[PDB]
Design a protein around this nucleic acid. Structure first.
Ligand code: NA
Lengths: 102, 100, 107, 107
DNA sequence: TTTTTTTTTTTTTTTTT
């Protein structure tokens, strides 16, 4: 079968402290938000880190205000809202993170 | 002042012929869909559908004229979440034709 | 009563199209940048000195705004001025300019 | 190392009074020179130039014979001494790098 | 869902002890 490509790279600033989500059914995931600012037009990205090891590094060292570079893939995710309606959410699943500030 | 990066690279198959729209108060904008696939087992393919927008003058003409249903292309651009809810789109600034 | 001398002569290449700066309370002035380049062989190195040129004199100010262009080669003469301005934080800063009183077009 | 390709000119001529005794700082002899313009009662505008003498030999001549209140003629080139301050903002430290000095009188 | 932070796009090439 022919192959495809789905890769993203981002460089920006973290909006809030990361959170480590553990759902009884599923693997743990580190979640945080990343702003990429054109200069002001700000784009807010939802980052997910599933990969073991990087997930814990991200949870330990990513902080509010941190500048980071990351690489990953785009995922158009799904969730049920409070009314149990099938919703759409986009996340960047990161597989490499480089820390850029102290 | 401080610089950011927001770049996407996609390579996949176009879903339908492109169309011309007004988007974000700008027009014309050339819109089409692109599928990228991943192999999974435990074989089968997970298809990710991307909404591609071409705002750039000239390139939007190229996209409308030459991108076709079932075309294979490589493209580059930036992510815009098209919020109002989300309507995520890849705003393309580079397109390489591979096969039709 | 004793007299001084403050003269500079430059021959070089213009870096950008000139601007006619007009400020409330001030005389108009034509501004542009001039590079004086030195190329040296040991393989070939370059040293570029970038000068800020101001033209206040009427007539020459308008000739300079009309005919000085990015990339133009020119000879000029003038005097050195260590000008003062204030940044956003109200700190006194220095900006050097060559106040030109003669310009000869070479290209 | 010799000059090649398109040539430029960067030459300053000053005549004025030395402000303080020169000091030693690639050793370099440094001093200040005042050039004055008359303006209209009758007032003066003083321009203070930072003189650097890098050239061997002449740097020692300057340190030995240039004194506070000396009147001199000098020639050289402008160097803007660009650098980065604490916040990565470009600053100037303009200096006239002198290569010819003619003594006129001292106090 | 709310949220982040601040180093940045000037020159030419017919010729030189
Ligand atoms: Na700054």
């Amino acid at each position: 079968l022919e192959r495809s490509l789905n890769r993203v790279h981002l460089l920006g600033r973290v909006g809030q402290d990361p959170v480590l989500r553990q759902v009884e059914g599923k693997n743990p995931v580190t979640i945080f938000s990343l702003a990429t600012n054109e200069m002001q037009k700000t784009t807010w990205h939802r980052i997910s880190v599933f990969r073991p090891g990087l997930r814990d590094v991200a949870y330990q060292y990513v902080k509010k205000g941190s500048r980071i570079y990351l690489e990953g893939k785009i995922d158009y995710g799904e969730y049920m809202d409070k009314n149990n309606v099938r919703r759409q959410a986009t996340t960047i699943i990161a597989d490499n993170i480089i820390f850029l500030s102290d």
